[PDB]
Design a protein around this nucleic acid. Sequence first.
DNA 1: GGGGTTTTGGGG
DNA 2: GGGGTTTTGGGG
DNA 3: GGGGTTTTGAGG
Lengths: 460, 216
Amino acid sequence: YEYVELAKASLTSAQPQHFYAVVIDATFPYKTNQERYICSLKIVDPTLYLKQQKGAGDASDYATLVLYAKRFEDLPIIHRAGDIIRVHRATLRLYNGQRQFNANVFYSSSWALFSTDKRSVTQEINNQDAVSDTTPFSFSSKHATIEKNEISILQNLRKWANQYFSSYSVISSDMYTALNKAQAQKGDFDVVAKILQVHELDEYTNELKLKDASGQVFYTLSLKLKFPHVRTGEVVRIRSATYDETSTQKKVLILSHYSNIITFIQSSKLAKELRAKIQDDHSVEVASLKKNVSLNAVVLTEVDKKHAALPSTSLQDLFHHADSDKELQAQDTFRTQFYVTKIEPSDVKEWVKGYDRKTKKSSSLKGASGKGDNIFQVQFLVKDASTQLNNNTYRVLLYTQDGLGANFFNVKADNLHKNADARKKLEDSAELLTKFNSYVDAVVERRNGFYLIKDTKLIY
Amino acid sequence: QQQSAFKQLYTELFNNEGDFSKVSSNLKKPLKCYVKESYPHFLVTDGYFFVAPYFTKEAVNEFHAKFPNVNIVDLTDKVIVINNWSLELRRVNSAEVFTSYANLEARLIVHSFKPNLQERLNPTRYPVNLFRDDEFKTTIQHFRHTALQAAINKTVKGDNLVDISKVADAAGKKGKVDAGIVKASASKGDEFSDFSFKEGNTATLKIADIFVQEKG
DNA sequence: GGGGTTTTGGGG
DNA sequence: GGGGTTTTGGGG
DNA sequence: GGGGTTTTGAGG
Ligand SMILES: [Cl-]
Ligand code: NA
Ligand code: NA
Ligand code: NA
Ligand code: NA
C-alpha cells in the first residue's frame, strides 16, 4: 500500500487511494435507511490543516471523509478529537470546494484507528494499557495489518498531531456557536463547552451541565451507553445540537442520533485553556432554591479533593451486592450520589445527642450536658437512580462520635435545644436535603454493615 | 409560555395527580396534529413532540363511517383533528412501552378525530418523544418523589436509629449491608406502587387490530 | 477485477 | 453463489 | 455528504 498526503491526493485518478490522517471531527455513525449507515468526519495532516492565514483568522482547513456501511459495527466511533485514522481504498472528489474522500466499507474499503495519546478513550475508561504503540484500538473487517514501513508514518503523524493541537485551536471559532447565541440559530449548531456536572437522571441517561466560554449554562441529555466518556471538568465539542424552545425551566440542548460528544487529546491547547478559563457556576442552583419546585437538579455537597478521583458506586451495588461482589468486598471506602427521602430522627433538635465514650451510649440533650460529648447521630433514608423503581429506601449514617462527617453541616455539633443559631441552620439544611431534585455526592466508609458519611460537606 | 401543546397538557396532568378534571379547561380544545407515523406505531406531533394516541373502538367505527375512503393505518404524513379526547395516567412497563417513563404513561384517549386529507402543515423541528424530554422526565420524577416521600413518612416511624454502639468500636464487628435496607411502603411487590392517583381505565384498540380491520 | 469462499466455473 | 461494480464473462 | 433508524423506538 502506498499512502498519500491529503493535499497531494489526485482529484482526477478516481482510483482508490490510501492515507493516514488526524480526525478533528466526526458525527456518530448513524442509520439513513433500511440498509445504510454513515459516518462523516473531518481530517487533517501536515499538508492540509490551516487556511491561508492572513485574512483567514487562523481558521482550520481540512478534508472530509464519508464512510459508508451496511452495518453499524462497521463504522468508527470517534469519542476523541486528535486520534489518527488509516483508510484504504478511498475515492476522492471535489464537493462544494473541498476535498472529499469517500469509502464504501461495505465493499472493499477499510479504516483503522490509532491512539495519539498513550491510551485510547475506551482504554482510559477501563484503565487498560495499549498492546503497543503500533496496534489499532479499532478497525473494520476481521483483520488489520501494520507493515514495518508504516511505523514511521504513524510515529511522525503522532508527533505532528501533538504539535498541531498544542499550537492551534484545531476546532476554530468558525466551527461552533456560543451558547448565549444558541437561540438565534435557525437549525442545528456545534458547541465547545466544559462539563461542569454529570447528573445520572436515570438508568440509561446522563444529564450534562455545560458552560462554554460565553458563560452561558445549558443542559443536555447524554445516553450512558453512547457517550461513556463524559467526565466532569473536561472540555468537549458537541457535533450537532439544537436549541429547545419548549424548555422553559432551564436552557436545554437537544441531540440527535447522529450527534456526537468529543473530547480532546492531552496536548490540546483549546481544551487546556477552557478547563482553566471556564469556572463552575452555581447561579442555577441558587436561584432554584427559592422555588417550591425545581426542575433543575442541585448537588448539595462536595467531597474532599483527595476523593475527586474516586469512582462512584450506585446504591444498587452498595446495598445488594457489597457482600457478594469480589471487587466490592475489597473496599471499605466508597463514593456515591443519592437523594434524601427522609431524615431521622424527625425532630431536628435530636440530631445532636450527648455521647459517653466509655459506655458507647448516646442520649438526648433535652436534659442537658449530663450526657457527655455532643455528636451528630443522623440517619438518612436515601434512594438513587439504580434503585428508583424498587420499594426500598436505604440507610446512610452521619454518626460523628469518631470524627467521621463531623463538618458535614458546616455546623459544629451543639445542644440544639439551647443553641438557636445551630438549630436554625440545621432545620434549613433539612428542608433542602429532602426537597425534590436535591442530591448528595458523598464519600462513605463501611463499618459493621453500615455506611457512614465522611469527608463530605454541604456547599449551600 | 409553553409552546408545545402536548408538553403542557401532559405536564399539568402529572402535576395534578393524574386528575384530568383539574387540568386547565382552556386546554381541552380540539387538537390539530401532524401524523408522523401510522404503522407499526401511530405517532402524531404537535410541532415539537410526538405522542401515541389511543383510539377507542367507538372512535374508529365512527371514523370508518364518515370516511369510508380513508384507512387510518395509511394516514402517515397526513393531518388529523381530534375533536373529542381525554387524558389518563396508566401504570406500564417502560422497558416495553417507549412512550412511557418510570413505569408511568399519560395516554391520549381519542374518542373522535377527523382526517383533514391533503392539508400541508407548516415546517417544524424534528419531533421528539415526549417521554424522552429532560424537563418532562423530571416532571414525572417529581411526581414519584412526592408519592414516595409521602408513602415513606407514613410507613417509617419510631426513629429506629442504628444503635451508635454498632458503628463505634467496630474492630471485631462485621455486618451485612442489607441491614440498611428499609421498606418504603406497604407495597405488595418489590416495586414501589403506593400512588394516590386512581389509574384511569378505558378499553383501547391495538394498532394491529385496526390493521387487520382494514386489510386482513 | 478481486473477496471470501467453495461456487472451484459462471449470474445478474 | 452472491455484492458491488462494471469486470458485463471469467481468476485464483 | 451538516445527516432522520427502530428485531435498536434507552448507541444506531
Ligand atoms: Cl462490615
Ligand atoms: Na467470483
Ligand atoms: Na469463487
Ligand atoms: Na461483475
Ligand atoms: Na464477479
